[PDB]
Amino acid sequence: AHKKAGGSTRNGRDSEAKRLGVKRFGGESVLAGSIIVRQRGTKFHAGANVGCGRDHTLFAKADGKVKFEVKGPKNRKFISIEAE
């Protein structure tokens, strides 16, 4: 014909971005309950004064200053808080 009709793709789908990542970095002063990192799995583990939610959201269990550190035999990344 004058023009050749094309096909169709089968890859159009994608899901919404979940806004994961670190919310407060090292040195941030946070209130109790502040979300530090939103995660899939425990890439960062909960240290002192830090709690882990059902979806592994790390949140502050006290007022203070955020600190990242590496601890344990496995060199895992822990998030703790110095109470200030």
Partner 1 sequence: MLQPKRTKFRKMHKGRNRGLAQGTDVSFGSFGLKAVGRGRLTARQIEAARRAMTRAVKRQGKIWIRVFPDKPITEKPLAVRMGKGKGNVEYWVALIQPGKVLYEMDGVPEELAREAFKLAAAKLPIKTTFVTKTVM
Q: b/e map of 33-68 (b: 16 or more CB within 10 Å)? A: ebebbbbeeeebbbbebbeeeeebebbbebebebbb
Q: Which is nearer to Mg ion, 11 or 75 (CB)?
A: 11
Q: Which is nearer to Mg ion, 9 or 75 (CB)?
A: 9
Q: List the alpha helices (DSSP H) in 1-84.
A: none
User: Applying CB under 8 A, does 9 fall inside the site for partner 1?
Assistant: yes
Q: Least Å distance between CB 80 and RNA?
A: 13
Q: Least Å distance between CB 2 and RNA?
A: 6
User: Applying CB under 7 A, does 33 fall inside the site for RNA?
Assistant: no
Which parts of this chain interact with partner 1 (CB under 8 A)?
Answer: 3-4, 6-11
